């Protein structure tokens, strides 16, 4: 509660604790290269 | 010193680092011979 006076109320902790916050950042992705000739035509000349 | 950093110490990956990889389920990349492992093996 704010005080209507020169003095002001302060809320200050009398106890302390340590806790760990875990964060994950994704800096990389799996790198994939596709062989189009085998995948699209299944090695068939007519498709090519 | 009194603070324990053994978990963060390299065992080289650290213990927490190795534990995270073990907990996550990842298919073996097999970069050296993966195609051979899929075939005869």
């Amino acid at each position: 509660d704010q005080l209507n006076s020169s003095y002001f109320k302060l809320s200050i902790p009398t106890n302390f604790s340590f806790g760990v916050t875990q964060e994950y950042i994704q800096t990389t992705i799996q790198k994939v290269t596709v062989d189009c000739k085998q995948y699209v035509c299944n090695g068939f000349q007519k498709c090519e | 010193g009194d603070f324990n950093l053994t978990l963060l110490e390299p065992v080289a990956r650290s213990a927490i680092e190795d534990l995270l990889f073990d907990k996550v389920t990842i298919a073996d990349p097999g970069y050296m011979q993966g195609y051979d492992d899929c075939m005869q093996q």
């Binding site: 290269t33 062989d35 085998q38 | 195609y35 899929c38 075939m39």
Partner: protein, 48 residues
């Protein structure tokens, strides 16, 4: 009793024969090819 066996992908991974020796069918896997080339050398290295 049933003949050819298929996986969830519907690829033909199995076959049944009159001899009774089970055969697992694996499609002829392609061998990956990549080119490592340096313009100054004007030479290339095949990569698998």
């Amino acid at each position: 009793q049933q003949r050819f066996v298929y996986d969830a992908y519907q690829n033909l991974v199995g076959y049944y024969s009159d001899d009774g020796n089970y055969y697992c069918l694996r499609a002829c896997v392609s061998v990956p090819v990549s080119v490592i080339y340096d313009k100054e050398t004007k030479t290339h290295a095949t990569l698998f």
